[PDB]
Amino acid sequence: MERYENLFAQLNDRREGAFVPFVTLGDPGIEQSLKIIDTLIDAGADALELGVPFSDPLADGPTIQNANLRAFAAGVTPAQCFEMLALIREKHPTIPIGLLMYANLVFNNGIDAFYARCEQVGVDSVLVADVPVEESAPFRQAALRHNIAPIFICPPNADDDLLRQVASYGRGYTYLLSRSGLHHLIEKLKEYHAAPALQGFGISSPEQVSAAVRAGAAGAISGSAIVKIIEKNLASPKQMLAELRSFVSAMKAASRA
Amino acid sequence: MERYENLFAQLNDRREGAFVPFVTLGDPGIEQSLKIIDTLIDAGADALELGVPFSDPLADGPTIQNANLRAFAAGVTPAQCFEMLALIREKHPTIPIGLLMYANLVFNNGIDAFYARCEQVGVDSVLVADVPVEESAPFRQAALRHNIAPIFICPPNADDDLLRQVASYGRGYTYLLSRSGLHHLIEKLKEYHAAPALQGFGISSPEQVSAAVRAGAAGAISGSAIVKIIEKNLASPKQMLAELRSFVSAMKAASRA
Amino acid sequence: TTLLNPYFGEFGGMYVPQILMPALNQLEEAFVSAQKDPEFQAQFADLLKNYAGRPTALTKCQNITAGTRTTLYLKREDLLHGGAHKTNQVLGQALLAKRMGKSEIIAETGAGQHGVASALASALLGLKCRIYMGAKDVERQSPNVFRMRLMGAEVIPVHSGSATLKDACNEALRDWSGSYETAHYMLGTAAGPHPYPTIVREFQRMIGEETKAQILDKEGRLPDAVIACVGGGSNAIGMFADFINDTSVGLIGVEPGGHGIETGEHGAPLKHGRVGIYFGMKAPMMQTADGQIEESYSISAGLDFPSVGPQHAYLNSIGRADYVSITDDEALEAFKTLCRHEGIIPALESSHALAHALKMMREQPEKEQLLVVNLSGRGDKDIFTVHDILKARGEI
Amino acid sequence: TTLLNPYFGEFGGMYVPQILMPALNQLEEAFVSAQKDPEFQAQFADLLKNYAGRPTALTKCQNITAGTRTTLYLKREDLLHGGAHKTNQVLGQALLAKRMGKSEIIAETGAGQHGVASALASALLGLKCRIYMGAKDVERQSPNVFRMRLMGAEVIPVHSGSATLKDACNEALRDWSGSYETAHYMLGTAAGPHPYPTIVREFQRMIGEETKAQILDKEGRLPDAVIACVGGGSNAIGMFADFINDTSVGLIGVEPGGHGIETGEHGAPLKHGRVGIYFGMKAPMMQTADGQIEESYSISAGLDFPSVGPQHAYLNSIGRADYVSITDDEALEAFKTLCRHEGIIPALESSHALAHALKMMREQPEKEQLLVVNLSGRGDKDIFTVHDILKARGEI
Ligand SMILES: O=C(NCCOP(=O)(O)O)c1ccc(OC(F)(F)F)cc1
Ligand SMILES: O=C(NCCOP(=O)(O)O)c1ccc(OC(F)(F)F)cc1
Ligand SMILES: O=C(NCCOP(=O)(O)O)c1ccc(OC(F)(F)F)cc1
Ligand SMILES: O=C(NCCOP(=O)(O)O)c1ccc(OC(F)(F)F)cc1
Ligand SMILES: *Cc1c(COP(=O)(O)O)cnc(C)c1O
Ligand SMILES: *Cc1c(COP(=O)(O)O)cnc(C)c1O
Ligand code: NA
Ligand code: NA
């Protein structure tokens, strides 16, 4: 499919940025997570980034570490995540769906088989957090053979060789990091015909979405801010969804011309 | 004085051995110790060997270690021991009195001064347990200047040089050890004109006294056996003295022709 | 692109987030430079000799082998300053950090030994050291925590995840990704992403180099086998490296068998795990059927890394080295045996290596063989562990 | 009559019951013979090198002395097998016991270190070792007791007297007087009756011999002073002996000052006691006005001998060596300082020596001086003692 290409062309026609929430699949349980995701979409999410719970998420801060723990408390497994993904795609045929994976879960039963399963359930992209471009070949190749976009991170200091590699190897979008653990990066990515850039890390208010789009990014990704709302409202699921709806509506509105 | 020479000449006229009890001065207290000593004499002790309590009696087994501890529990000091000795001599003008000392108590305030104090209270001999003949010169010299007999141990294996040294250096009697931690020793001591031999260590029954005298010794010394009787009867002082009287009478009777 | 090969056959690599690649590349460049620099080599050698106490003895154990045709030597890393081999490589890494102009050290620790080694190197060399330690380990290893603090290190309890070694490792890497301009990550074994498996081997290789010279001096020939325990792989690769090209010399690595391989409660991923990608590398690990990383188990906390250095996986795959396992009880028996017969209290880690040598001897007592065991550390730290077990099961 | 002089001026001698003289004479003869025997010397040297780890390093401590004109080296007896200098002389004494045809060893211990050293030497050399230890010490030193037992020694609690070191010493001597035909008494310091002060010095003198060669190599001159703690005197005389005839080299012995000399709670008989006769020798001791032997006190149990070796009393009397004291708090500060600034955890005993060197430096920081401290042992054993004090007084 070409779901990201279609989205970005449609947003460009509307002079509009993408707003892309991240959540952990199965946080805080399978059924509430499905409701959370439907609420994110109904509230205006342009695409989704979805984490599969992993025992040791090195690239994640405490908020998302805790989201993974909550999902593990509910017994969530990768197989259950793929069952969820199939249901999500069945309900929502056009929204781009990207996974955020750690390498072991992709490599475990075979890299090809992982990307084959992504294609089968209707996933559009995979970002493997701990595979740098230098190690990426078997991943990006398997991705492309199964019509999955391999997503790469472009760190804030990327030298020129790295920019060119990310531009060549990525598809779907380029994940532009706000920081470590800018118009120069954005223009160079465009010069090298990279996939459109989505800014992520630390995006938690409407003005940041507008700023990202003004800097020339195609949109913004927000995770910890969304997951915080989950964490805050564990005792009241209904208020959780209302607070999520309110947050996403505001972030998406900031992306519109 | 010549109290040992007088005793041994008198016993020899009666074809009789000496029986010599050992006790710790001030065990289990000063007044009971004075009574114990009067009872030993009345019951037939020919001479006394008397220990001054010392913090670390290396040459002593557990029975006498405990006698020292009891005396320390009663606050007994060397000064109090010398006060006791003066009273004993005042009551009993002819009985030979020997002390069993450790070196530090003799050296502490000056070797000469120690032997001068012995002479003043009427002590007849001193055995310093941890001064071998090799270290004995200042001790035996000070002893002799104050008319005190220096007593030496003759161990069971004494080679010929040691026998000759003990014979030359000792006075009063020769302390003949029954064992470590015999007619050859006795005859050689007599050949070298040694002070008469008293056998000690492990002497606890009448037959041992008779045997010692038959082997040619001038008598026998008994300590732990006497001190055991004290230890056994701490709760009944009166029975203590009766049991001591009975034990000493029996041991002394075994020494008679 | 790298200066040196990041792989040993299939195994190894640099499986870290993109943001950490510049730190790894910087470190590789610094290391390649230092290895060619006679001044760096001389400074390292000087610290090893005059501070740490190298060379370490090679001790013949004739009481242990009585009545057999085995001759056994122990390479005495238990006599190294700090009481374990870890000191060698922390000194090298501290010098590298200084070469790169860094004033700060980050380290992870589980049992606390690497923490203590990192702390002493940092104290000596004027580096500000912070150590990540899982909160369960902090609570479990009070003596080592207090040593680290005495030596001026900041000990940071990690309450996240399961609050053990892998969580400390992750917290250390998170910190480094933000601080690598001024802080060096002093990884504690011959594992993790390139260039660490290579750096740690090179900064431990004096173990085998000395052993070779000492055995040639004492016996006029090379060993039939050199035997080392394998937690992450550093003491073993340090012993092995100089002998790899001596094809007659057996290289035997000993993983912890815990309660027994068949119980699943063990620490032997190399022979009983499955290849995965974690800890920045492709290597055998302890993992679920699903790919979640699970724990090692051993009586010896120092052998709890649930994976293994990639060079060991490679040496096994080609048949150059052989890997075996030893149970808790076998290790305990070897510990008791050394204490009684040679007056040397071995680390429980090292006791696994010794236990395997004892088996080689006992199983075939008329086999003529010359064996060296790497005695990777001293076992003063283990006497309470050993006491409590012996008491619980009735003896003593 | 003896082969060698039993006295150092007034001090020393053989003040034992007559029954023990043949044991002492036998031992003296055996020692004089062994010292002339190149085979004995070679066997001893071989054990020292290949089992114990000699030579020990001489480590320059430049962080400690920063900003001053003091250059400080530590002689690293903390790196010796067993973690203290005591190992040197027990190996020599075990070889002497074998030379005399004995199969059994008797030893005394207070803090347990000499017990552990005697046990490891006996395990190595095939001797049946029994160790006397006051019951209060047994209860107080569980870790060392279990080490001794692991190494096959029989540990015999002494409940008599005050159930501490002097009672253990007495029980050991009682046993020996009956068993000396088949058992050797392995006395643990350079004190007691002749020939022990001489034997123990000679079997520790490699400390100073190495230090001399190492300092000449590293500085091209001798030290201005060598500084050692003094409990009974063995590590100090071992450091001092080779320098006695180098009249420019200061010899500084450090006794424990405990809570302060003025409190009476200390362990400094050499400078603050009175000559007496006890422990088989004429020497300064801690005693009442009446002559009863009293106790030392120090934070460091290893410095609790309430007397001192006679050669130290003699070297003091002629002005060749100088003796000073260091309090518990000064020792604690030196312990903390070494840990933090050099990454070396010193025994609390050795910390007394270090504390005095620190004072020499701090009191006169522009005085140019080259100092060696004998770091007689490692301080892993003291970390709980140090922790508990620091906790009790608020810090940490
Ligand atoms: O999208 C992610 N998180 C959600 C957005 O960040 P935030 O809103 O700050 O939680 C996200 C993306 C990549 C990642 O790993 C690595 F960078 F290594 F590839 C970790 C988290
Ligand atoms: O007379 C003594 N004890 C009493 C008699 O012995 P026993 O009846 O067995 O207690 C006695 C004599 C000497 C001695 O020390 C040494 F031998 F070294 F000089 C210790 C005890
Ligand atoms: O085993 C490790 N360290 C040893 C700690 O030693 P100790 O203090 O004795 O537990 C260890 C630490 C980090 C690592 O890689 C990565 F950083 F990526 F996670 C791999 C192994
Ligand atoms: O200090 C002594 N031993 C050291 C024990 O060392 P540690 O185990 O560290 O207490 C010590 C032991 C015996 C001695 O002489 C004598 F045997 F006559 F009593 C003098 C000093
Ligand atoms: C840490 C440790 C080990 C295990 O680590 P490796 O990297 O596998 O060598 C082994 N022995 C001792 C004494 C240790 O401290
Ligand atoms: C026993 C001990 C001492 C004290 O004994 P000396 O005979 O006076 O040397 C000093 N340091 C250490 C480390 C010890 O174990
Ligand atoms: Na492992
Ligand atoms: Na002393």
Side-chain angles (χ1 to χ4, degrees):
Chain A
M1 301 284 297
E2 309 202 318
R3 294 192 180 81
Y4 286 103
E5 299 96 300
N6 290 344
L7 176 67
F8 285 125
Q10 290 159 4
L11 294 171
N12 185 56
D13 293 345
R14 307 202 297 274
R15 300 297 179 271
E16 197 170 295
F19 178 62
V20 182
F22 165 97
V23 292
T24 294
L25 288 160
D27 172 27
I30 294 181
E31 297 305 310
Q32 179 71 356
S33 180
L34 289 168
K35 294 188 195 168
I36 281 159
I37 289 160
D38 285 346
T39 291
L40 300 179
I41 295 168
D42 194 61
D46 291 301
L48 301 178
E49 192 190 33
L50 301 171
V52 173
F54 182 56
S55 58
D56 294 281
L58 165 60
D60 285 301
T63 297
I64 289 150
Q65 290 164 36
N66 283 320
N68 285 275
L69 291 177
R70 283 196 294 280
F72 280 127
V76 172
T77 66
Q80 287 178 337
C81 291
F82 278 101
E83 291 165 356
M84 288 177 74
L85 290 163
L87 294 170
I88 295 160
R89 171 62 67 216
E90 193 175 23
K91 287 184 298 201
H92 302 284
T94 64
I95 185 166
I97 294 167
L99 303 184
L100 177 59
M101 298 304 303
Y102 285 82
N104 204 51
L105 296 179
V106 174
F107 179 80
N108 182 55
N109 183 50
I111 294 174
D112 261 304
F114 181 84
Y115 285 100
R117 186 73 173 123
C118 288
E119 182 179 25
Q120 174 175 46
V121 296
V123 162
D124 301 296
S125 68
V126 173
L127 197 175
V128 190
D130 53 348
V131 174
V133 293
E134 293 83 357
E135 295 289 358
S136 67
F139 295 89
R140 61 196 209 242
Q141 299 158 1
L144 293 170
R145 297 187 293 271
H146 294 97
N147 304 297
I148 304 301
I151 307 299
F152 296 100
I153 296 280
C154 174
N157 57 344
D159 67 13
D160 196 69
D161 286 350
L162 180 57
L163 286 164
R164 287 168 180 275
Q165 284 184 289
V166 165
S168 177
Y169 295 170
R171 295 293 200 283
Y173 63 90
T174 302
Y175 194 121
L176 181 66
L177 272 178
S178 302
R179 47 163 182 76
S180 84
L182 203 155
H183 302 71
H184 181 268
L185 294 170
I186 292 156
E187 300 280 27
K188 297 305 294 197
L189 286 168
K190 282 176 185 177
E191 176 184 342
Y192 302 143
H193 301 96
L198 293 185
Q199 195 175 335
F201 279 46
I203 304 297
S204 66
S205 60
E207 75 192 347
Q208 291 174 285
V209 177
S210 62
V213 176
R214 198 154 51 242
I221 296 160
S222 174
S224 294
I226 300 260
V227 175
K228 267 190 192 70
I229 293 160
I230 296 178
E231 184 187 339
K232 293 308 97 200
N233 294 287
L234 292 168
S236 182
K238 188 182 172 178
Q239 183 180 347
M240 190 190 287
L241 297 179
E243 291 201 2
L244 287 165
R245 170 177 292 285
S246 174
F247 182 71
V248 173
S249 291
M251 298 292 274
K252 172 57 200 175
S255 72
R256 294 198 181 94
Chain B
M1 301 284 297
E2 309 202 318
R3 294 192 180 81
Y4 286 103
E5 299 96 300
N6 290 344
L7 176 67
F8 285 125
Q10 290 159 4
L11 294 171
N12 185 56
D13 293 345
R14 307 202 297 274
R15 300 297 179 271
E16 197 170 295
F19 178 62
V20 182
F22 165 97
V23 292
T24 294
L25 288 160
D27 172 27
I30 294 181
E31 297 305 310
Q32 179 71 356
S33 180
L34 289 168
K35 294 188 195 168
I36 281 159
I37 289 160
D38 285 346
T39 291
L40 300 179
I41 295 168
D42 194 61
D46 291 301
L48 301 178
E49 192 190 33
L50 301 171
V52 173
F54 182 56
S55 58
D56 294 281
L58 165 60
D60 285 301
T63 297
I64 289 150
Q65 290 164 36
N66 283 319
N68 285 275
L69 291 177
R70 283 196 294 280
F72 280 127
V76 172
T77 66
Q80 287 178 337
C81 291
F82 278 101
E83 291 165 356
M84 288 177 74
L85 290 163
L87 294 170
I88 295 160
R89 171 62 67 216
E90 193 175 23
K91 287 184 298 201
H92 302 284
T94 64
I95 185 166
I97 294 167
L99 303 184
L100 177 59
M101 298 304 303
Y102 285 82
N104 204 51
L105 296 179
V106 174
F107 179 80
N108 182 55
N109 183 50
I111 294 174
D112 261 304
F114 181 84
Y115 285 100
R117 186 73 173 123
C118 288
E119 182 179 25
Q120 174 175 46
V121 296
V123 162
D124 301 296
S125 68
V126 173
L127 197 175
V128 190
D130 53 348
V131 174
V133 293
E134 293 83 357
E135 295 289 358
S136 67
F139 295 89
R140 61 196 209 242
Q141 299 158 1
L144 293 170
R145 297 187 293 271
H146 294 97
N147 304 297
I148 304 301
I151 307 299
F152 296 100
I153 296 280
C154 174
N157 57 344
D159 67 13
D160 196 69
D161 286 350
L162 180 57
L163 286 164
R164 287 168 180 275
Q165 284 184 289
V166 165
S168 177
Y169 295 170
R171 295 293 200 283
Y173 63 90
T174 302
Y175 194 121
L176 181 66
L177 272 178
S178 302
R179 47 163 182 76
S180 84
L182 203 155
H183 302 71
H184 181 268
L185 294 170
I186 292 156
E187 300 280 27
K188 297 305 294 197
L189 286 168
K190 282 176 185 177
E191 176 184 342
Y192 302 143
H193 301 96
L198 293 185
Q199 195 175 335
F201 279 46
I203 304 297
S204 66
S205 60
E207 75 192 347
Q208 291 174 285
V209 177
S210 62
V213 176
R214 198 154 51 242
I221 296 160
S222 174
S224 294
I226 300 260
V227 175
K228 267 190 192 70
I229 293 160
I230 296 178
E231 184 187 339
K232 293 308 97 200
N233 294 287
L234 292 168
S236 182
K238 188 182 172 178
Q239 183 180 347
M240 190 190 287
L241 297 179
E243 291 201 2
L244 287 165
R245 170 177 292 285
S246 174
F247 182 71
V248 173
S249 291
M251 298 292 274
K252 172 57 200 175
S255 72
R256 294 198 181 94
Chain C
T1 289
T2 60
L3 297 172
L4 305 174
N5 190 345
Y7 281 92
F8 303 88
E10 178 188 3
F11 308 103
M14 298 172 81
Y15 292 91
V16 295
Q18 194 72 55
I19 186 66
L20 271 168
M21 294 292 292
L24 295 173
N25 287 321
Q26 173 189 47
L27 173 64
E28 187 197 47
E29 199 177 326
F31 170 75
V32 165
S33 183
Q35 290 301 89
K36 290 172 195 168
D37 183 352
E39 295 186 331
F40 180 100
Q41 294 310 310
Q43 185 163 12
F44 186 29
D46 174 68
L47 294 177
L48 293 167
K49 181 188 173 184
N50 296 305
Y51 176 77
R54 300 213 74 85
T56 61
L58 185 71
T59 303
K60 191 162 77 158
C61 290
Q62 54 203 326
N63 298 328
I64 282 199
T65 60
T68 79
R69 297 194 72 190
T70 294
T71 300
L72 176 65
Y73 285 84
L74 309 175
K75 178 59 172 166
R76 307 292 304 282
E77 300 299 295
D78 62 299
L79 295 178
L80 201 63
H81 179 56
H85 69 293
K86 290 191 174 67
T87 298
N88 295 316
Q89 74 97 9
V90 293
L91 290 168
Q93 281 204 61
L95 291 172
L96 278 184
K98 294 168 73 81
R99 185 188 189 80
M100 289 182 290
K102 302 197 189 172
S103 66
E104 289 179 17
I105 293 292
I106 302 160
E108 84 289 348
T109 198
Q113 182 60 227
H114 183 59
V116 168
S118 293
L120 67 85
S122 298
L124 179 64
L125 294 166
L127 299 166
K128 191 165 174 268
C129 181
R130 57 183 180 274
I131 301 170
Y132 288 95
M133 196 173 189
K136 289 176 190 161
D137 288 324
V138 169
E139 197 282 339
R140 186 150 57 192
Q141 302 285 355
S142 307
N144 281 342
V145 172
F146 186 56
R147 289 182 176 97
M148 294 174 236
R149 283 174 173 152
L150 278 166
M151 293 186 301
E154 180 186 6
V155 181
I156 302 167
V158 179
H159 299 278
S160 71
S162 37
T164 53
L165 174 60
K166 53 182 194 65
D167 308 293
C169 289
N170 287 316
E171 209 56 34
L173 286 168
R174 295 181 182 114
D175 178 338
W176 197 39
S177 75
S179 60
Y180 71 88
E181 295 166 329
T182 62
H184 174 61
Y185 179 38
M186 184 176 278
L187 205 159
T189 190
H194 179 79
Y196 291 100
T198 297
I199 292 174
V200 174
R201 175 191 75 223
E202 290 301 301
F203 291 169
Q204 288 293 358
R205 75 176 299 129
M206 64 290 300
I207 297 169
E209 283 168 356
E210 294 176 8
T211 298
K212 175 179 286 179
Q214 287 168 314
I215 196 74
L216 284 171
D217 180 51
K218 291 181 182 74
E219 296 288 339
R221 50 158 294 175
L222 299 175
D224 294 307
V226 300
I227 308 142
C229 71
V230 174
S234 67
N235 90 90
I237 204 69
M239 177 55 86
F240 295 174
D242 205 60
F243 295 105
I244 288 171
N245 293 341
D246 300 297
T247 62
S248 73
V249 175
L251 307 178
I252 303 170
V254 186
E255 299 190 280
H259 295 314
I261 297 306
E262 74 288 344
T263 74
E265 294 173 29
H266 63 79
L270 192 158
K271 296 301 297 288
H272 303 284
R274 187 155 61 76
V275 185
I277 297 172
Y278 179 38
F279 307 110
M281 59 175 183
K282 182 176 290 181
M285 45 195 53
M286 314 284 271
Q287 53 174 324
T288 64
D290 262 4
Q292 305 297 354
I293 316 292
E294 70 202 2
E295 293 187 61
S296 277
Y297 162 74
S298 179
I299 191 174
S300 183
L303 304 181
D304 270 36
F305 187 55
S307 186
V308 67
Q311 187 165 11
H312 292 292
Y314 174 69
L315 290 167
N316 181 55
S317 70
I318 65 176
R320 175 66 190 98
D322 305 298
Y323 299 81
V324 299
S325 66
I326 284 291
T327 65
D328 286 359
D329 287 345
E330 289 169 325
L332 286 165
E333 187 271 320
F335 179 103
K336 286 197 294 190
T337 289
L338 199 66
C339 287
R340 175 69 195 96
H341 297 286
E342 303 292 344
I344 303 169
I345 310 181
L348 283 172
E349 295 87 343
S350 321
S351 294
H352 286 74
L354 181 59
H356 187 71
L358 292 175
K359 185 178 302 197
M360 292 168 68
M361 175 180 74
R362 289 164 178 167
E363 286 189 2
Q364 303 181 310
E366 281 72 65
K367 181 179 181 173
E368 194 179 9
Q369 53 192 334
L370 174 58
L371 306 182
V372 179
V373 162
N374 202 25
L375 207 74
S376 59
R378 63 171 175 255
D380 298 284
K381 70 191 173 72
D382 296 305
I383 63 168
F384 303 105
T385 293
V386 172
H387 173 273
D388 289 356
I389 282 157
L390 294 186
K391 182 125 96 82
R393 64 183 46 170
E395 57 233 66
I396 93 164
Chain D
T1 289
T2 60
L3 297 172
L4 305 174
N5 190 345
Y7 281 92
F8 303 88
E10 178 188 3
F11 308 103
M14 298 172 81
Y15 292 91
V16 295
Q18 194 72 55
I19 186 66
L20 271 168
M21 294 292 292
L24 295 173
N25 287 321
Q26 173 189 47
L27 173 64
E28 187 197 47
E29 199 177 326
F31 170 75
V32 165
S33 183
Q35 290 301 89
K36 290 172 195 168
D37 183 352
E39 295 186 331
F40 180 100
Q41 294 310 310
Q43 185 163 12
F44 186 29
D46 174 68
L47 294 177
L48 293 167
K49 181 188 173 184
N50 296 305
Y51 176 77
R54 300 213 74 85
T56 61
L58 185 71
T59 303
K60 191 162 77 158
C61 290
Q62 54 203 326
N63 298 328
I64 282 199
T65 60
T68 79
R69 297 194 72 190
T70 294
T71 300
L72 176 65
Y73 285 84
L74 309 175
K75 178 59 172 166
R76 307 292 304 282
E77 300 299 295
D78 62 299
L79 295 178
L80 201 63
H81 179 56
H85 69 293
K86 290 191 174 67
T87 298
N88 295 316
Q89 74 97 9
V90 293
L91 290 168
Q93 281 204 61
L95 291 172
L96 278 184
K98 294 168 73 81
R99 185 188 189 80
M100 289 182 290
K102 302 197 189 172
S103 66
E104 289 179 17
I105 293 292
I106 302 160
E108 84 289 348
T109 198
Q113 182 60 227
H114 183 59
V116 168
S118 293
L120 67 85
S122 298
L124 179 64
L125 294 166
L127 299 166
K128 191 165 174 268
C129 181
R130 57 183 180 274
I131 301 170
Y132 288 95
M133 196 173 189
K136 289 176 190 161
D137 288 324
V138 169
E139 197 282 339
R140 186 150 57 192
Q141 302 285 355
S142 307
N144 281 342
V145 172
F146 186 56
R147 289 182 176 97
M148 294 174 236
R149 283 174 173 152
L150 278 166
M151 293 186 301
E154 180 186 6
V155 181
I156 302 167
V158 179
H159 299 278
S160 71
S162 37
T164 53
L165 174 60
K166 53 182 194 65
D167 308 293
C169 289
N170 287 316
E171 209 56 34
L173 286 168
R174 295 181 182 114
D175 178 338
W176 197 39
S177 75
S179 60
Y180 71 88
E181 295 166 329
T182 62
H184 174 61
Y185 179 38
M186 184 176 278
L187 205 159
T189 190
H194 179 79
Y196 291 100
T198 297
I199 292 174
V200 174
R201 175 191 75 223
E202 290 301 301
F203 291 169
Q204 288 293 358
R205 75 176 299 129
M206 64 290 300
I207 297 169
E209 283 168 356
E210 294 176 8
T211 298
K212 175 179 286 179
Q214 287 168 314
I215 196 74
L216 284 171
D217 180 51
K218 291 181 182 74
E219 296 288 339
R221 50 158 294 175
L222 299 175
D224 294 307
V226 300
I227 308 142
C229 71
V230 174
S234 67
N235 90 90
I237 204 69
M239 177 55 86
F240 295 174
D242 205 60
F243 295 105
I244 288 171
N245 293 341
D246 300 297
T247 62
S248 73
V249 175
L251 307 178
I252 303 170
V254 186
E255 299 190 280
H259 295 314
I261 297 306
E262 74 288 344
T263 74
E265 294 173 29
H266 63 79
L270 192 158
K271 296 301 297 288
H272 303 284
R274 187 155 61 76
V275 185
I277 297 172
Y278 179 38
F279 307 110
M281 59 175 183
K282 182 176 290 181
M285 45 195 53
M286 314 284 271
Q287 53 174 324
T288 64
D290 262 4
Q292 305 297 354
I293 316 292
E294 70 202 2
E295 293 187 61
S296 277
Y297 162 74
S298 179
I299 191 174
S300 183
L303 304 181
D304 270 36
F305 187 55
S307 186
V308 67
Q311 187 165 11
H312 292 292
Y314 174 69
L315 290 167
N316 181 55
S317 70
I318 65 176
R320 175 66 190 98
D322 305 298
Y323 299 81
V324 299
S325 66
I326 284 291
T327 65
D328 286 359
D329 287 345
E330 289 169 325
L332 286 165
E333 187 271 320
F335 179 103
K336 286 197 294 190
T337 289
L338 199 66
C339 287
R340 175 69 195 96
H341 297 286
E342 303 292 344
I344 303 169
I345 310 181
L348 283 172
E349 295 87 343
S350 321
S351 294
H352 286 74
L354 181 59
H356 187 71
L358 292 175
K359 185 178 302 197
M360 292 168 68
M361 175 180 74
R362 289 164 178 167
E363 286 189 2
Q364 303 181 310
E366 281 72 65
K367 181 179 181 173
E368 194 179 9
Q369 53 192 334
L370 174 58
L371 306 182
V372 179
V373 162
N374 202 25
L375 207 74
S376 59
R378 63 171 175 255
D380 298 284
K381 70 191 173 72
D382 296 305
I383 63 168
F384 303 105
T385 293
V386 172
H387 173 273
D388 289 356
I389 282 157
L390 294 186
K391 182 125 96 82
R393 64 183 46 170
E395 57 233 66
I396 93 164

